[PDB]
Write a protein that binds this DNA or RNA. Sequence first.
RNA 1: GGCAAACAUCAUUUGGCCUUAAAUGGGAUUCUGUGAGAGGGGAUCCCUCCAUUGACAGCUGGACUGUUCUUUGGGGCCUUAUGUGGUGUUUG
RNA 2: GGCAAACAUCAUUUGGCCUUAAAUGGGAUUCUGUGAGAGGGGAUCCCUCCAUUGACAGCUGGACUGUUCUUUGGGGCCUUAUGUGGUGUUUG
Lengths: 213, 213, 225, 225
Amino acid sequence: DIQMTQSPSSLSASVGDRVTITCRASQSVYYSVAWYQQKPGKAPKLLIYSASYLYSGVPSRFSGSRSGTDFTLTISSLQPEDFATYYCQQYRRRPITFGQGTKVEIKRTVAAPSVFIFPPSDEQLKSGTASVVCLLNNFYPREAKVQWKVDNALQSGNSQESVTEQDSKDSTYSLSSTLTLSKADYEKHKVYACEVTHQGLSSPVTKSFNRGE
Amino acid sequence: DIQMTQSPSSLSASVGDRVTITCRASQSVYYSVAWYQQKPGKAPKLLIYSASYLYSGVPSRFSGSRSGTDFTLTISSLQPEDFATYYCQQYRRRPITFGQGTKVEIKRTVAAPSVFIFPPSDEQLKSGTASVVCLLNNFYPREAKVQWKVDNALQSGNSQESVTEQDSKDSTYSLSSTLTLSKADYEKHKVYACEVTHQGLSSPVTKSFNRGE
Amino acid sequence: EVQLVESGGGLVQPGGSLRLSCAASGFSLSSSSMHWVRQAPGKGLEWVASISPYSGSTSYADSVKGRFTISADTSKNTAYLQMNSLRAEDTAVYYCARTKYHYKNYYWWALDYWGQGTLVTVSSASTKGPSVFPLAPSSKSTSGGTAALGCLVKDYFPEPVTVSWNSGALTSGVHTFPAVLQSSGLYSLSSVVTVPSSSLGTQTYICNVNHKPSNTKVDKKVEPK
Amino acid sequence: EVQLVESGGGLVQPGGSLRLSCAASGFSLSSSSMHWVRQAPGKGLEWVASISPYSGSTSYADSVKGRFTISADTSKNTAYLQMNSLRAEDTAVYYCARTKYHYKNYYWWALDYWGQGTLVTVSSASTKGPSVFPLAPSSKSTSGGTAALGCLVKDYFPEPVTVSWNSGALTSGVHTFPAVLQSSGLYSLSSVVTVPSSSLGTQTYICNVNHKPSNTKVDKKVEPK
RNA sequence: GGCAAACAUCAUUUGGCCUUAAAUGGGAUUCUGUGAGAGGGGAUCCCUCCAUUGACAGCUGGACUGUUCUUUGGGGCCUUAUGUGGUGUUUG
RNA sequence: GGCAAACAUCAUUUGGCCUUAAAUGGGAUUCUGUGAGAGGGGAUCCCUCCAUUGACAGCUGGACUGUUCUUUGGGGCCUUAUGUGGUGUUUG
């Protein structure tokens, strides 16, 4: 019945910057607060226990302090691999309860994406569907816009995209937009293009192909 | 085969003094030299290996260096518990061979002996023998002279003495002189005394008793 | 040395059961308390159950009370989670954790080691293996630039899929995107690698797709038209 | 954890045999080389034999070759030293020592742990246990001084002898002297304790003498007339 | 005189197998308190060795060799001891 | 008013058994790079608790006591969890 209200939900900071995540407990927990780091696809690793003690093998740029019933985690010199979601937990009373989490992006310089476009394989069209893929490789920030134009007519409602997690080394994103059509509809048009707009692009970029070439 | 000539055989130095023991190798040994400390009656503990590396649990006031085929052990600030014998060994070729050793006495200030005299037990007189014991406790230096007087006549050659190893904490010695007699001879005299002369004694001291009471 | 290996996950119908197990190494179970913590995809962390194999004592979150049963076999040095009467809202990754015992304590401390977890998805859909298509270059840039090629893994269920390139020998420059759920209620993802435009006509680039749910594996070399 | 326990020493007539053993804990023999090193009384240290149980390879000092045989049974995790055809000039303390194995090496390094050792005396005399007498205060000194009491251990053979006080409960101020060889070819030593002049009339102090060769054990109270 | 060898001397010094296209060694910055032999491990960067992709040279292919350039890579299991270099002497 | 109990809140926090005359806790300086549970260890000094030998005191002996002096000593086997105090509210 103890609640760990953790804030902020998200933050981003440049490599080298100090960062503080905070967790306030509904009632007295006293030191029985731990802090965890969870990297995408990985299991949480324990960083801080007893509110201020580092678990063995945790870089010393991590630390924690207690102030009454407020607890803060501090990454004193943020590093590219520190992109993760961070969690507080109390173990003063049971049941144990966790904070809602805090996602930490790394802020790096603007990098425009390099763009690629992939026509559907002859191997797929024989199944009745055409998937057209547009690839936005290694950019920052995460905000990018992908429009699909089939014979220069803007498309609506037939694309879906997914974005990688921030690279633990260069702190960039990669985005994948797929344009799904029926073979029949696909064979009705010639020019397929994705047009990308992003912060480090002066003018929009379009990568295209003609169907049978 | 390989000869480890160690020097000096013995030395004495005050607490805090720097101390260098030296070990010269008959031929090339290269770094394969160890230094051992043997405290009296105890098993030797390893101190230095590879001529300069300290073994785990060795105080930093120890060190070793190599100069060609000469090797030295160094105590930068000598401590009382460092009273021991020190041994070099080569492990360059087999058989392994040792230095002759170096005993390290600690030189401290004069400490007067506490003196005691103990008549022989009635349990020993009933066995057919008389042992009279004179005890010199916690003095320095080791050089002390104990005389036996049976009714004030000096004794020679019917006593034997043994001395403790230097105490590893106060760096003093203890001495035991036993005057061994046949039971019958003991019933011939009344006054038994040991007379002690030592550096920290301005006048020489005698502890005596009358036979029995 | 210290590791925990969950197994027993997978796809299961709603109303059905599943028995996860966590096999521990490098420490005695009897000198720890073991815990299951689940993570609904996207949401945070929900403690599920705990057990002190030394005493056999167990405790459960009120949201699984009476459907789940944590337990431990101290000889096998593994721990288990019986899950009965599952619902869709039980779909999550399920981690087990260790809390090291310490004699000086007076209650249990943090969770100091977590298994990588196993995925439990509770659905009415069935296992469908993926299809694999090439994503091949257009040949726009000459020897000055690098090219991108890839594999598209479409129409499969359930998660996950894993892609490697040239059998794991090519790793630099590779992005496997998160799968997206299709209008057909199926998953689809892409994996891409960038390579020098000059190496296309000689070098072989093959993608290794594995969908362990369907016991499916595909190797598809990717070259242009 | 890491320790070595010599056993098997004692007295032996010239020409006889003895089988010392060293029982190791806290490390595997197969990952070390074990060594016997003796210390002639007064002399320094003489390496005697070595063995690498991983290979079974042995080496001997030219001074024992063909009279001694080192060995090890890796199941008992102990090592042995058979001594045949013994001579007087073999009388010494016999330590066993360990050199930790290391894969990076190209020959063995120094001896990094030594057992406490056992005494092997090769003589024609026979063991007879000692006598023990009290050495009690004389009650000479008034409020200026503290008093001294003790035990005398006379007419025994062979070395060694061990003395304790209050079963080891009283240590501060205690000196056990080296035995000296008497005109009879027997040893004799004393052990003393310093105590406050005041504590005699209440406290009981008992001395524990043990001459393990003859299976001899004695406890004697030391108080005044 | 070129050699071998034995010995002396000083100096330096982990050594293999299997699979592979290949299965080096060193330097720097930094993290890690023993979390498996801390004589460790991780990350990032530079050089070096091996292999490898382009390009270029060798008439042109296949090779193969090379490079002040370029691409991508360098696995697994072992090791329980006396190798190697210089100098000298002596022998064949 | 007083005492309980439950709850709220903040703070703090290992708990037993056996043997025993007794079976605390902390501080400073310094050595120890995990030697097997470092949340360690040792040394030196200090404070503190329990016991203890002497001194002074309670008429003297049991006994027993002390803001003072003094001697010496403080063992073993366990532990797998929600104790304790302050405050507030409610109930008896």
